[PDB]
Design a binder for these strands. Sequence first.
DNA 1: GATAAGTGTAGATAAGTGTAGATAAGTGTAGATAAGTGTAGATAAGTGTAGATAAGTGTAGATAAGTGTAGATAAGTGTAGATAAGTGTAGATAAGTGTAGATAAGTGTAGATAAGTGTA
Length: 56
Amino acid sequence: PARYSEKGLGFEVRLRDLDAEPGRKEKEEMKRIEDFIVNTGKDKDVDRDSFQTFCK
DNA sequence: GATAAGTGTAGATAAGTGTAGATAAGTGTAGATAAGTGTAGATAAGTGTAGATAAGTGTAGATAAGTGTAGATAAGTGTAGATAAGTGTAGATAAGTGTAGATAAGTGTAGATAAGTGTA
């Protein structure tokens, strides 16, 4: 995720419209979806592929 | 205490100025050509005059800008339910402070050598 990467390089989950401002729950849902992608799943599990292994 | 910077003193040459003569700058004077102006005639700028075409305006008809009017879809708002932001509450570890002993910063104190200044 770019969110945690100070150089901004990575991926992000975003609202579609550039003009919208995200609601209080939407900002958290977007962070959850980012985390889900990183973990490739709901829970953390070292036995599962990371997103890096998936992409490779 | 020992030498040589620093100044007064004495003589020898050539800067510095007045004086006298020889040539050519500087000015007045006389004559010869051509600048400078008035004068007379020939051509074409400059203006008024008369006719010929097409700018410039009013007039009449044909199409489509411009507005009011009627119906169909979906912006815009209120209303009802479902999940998870947001806050209070209870327990577990380790920040944060006071307290006790060991080492070495920090200061006073005593003696030896050499800048520090006067003197010959």
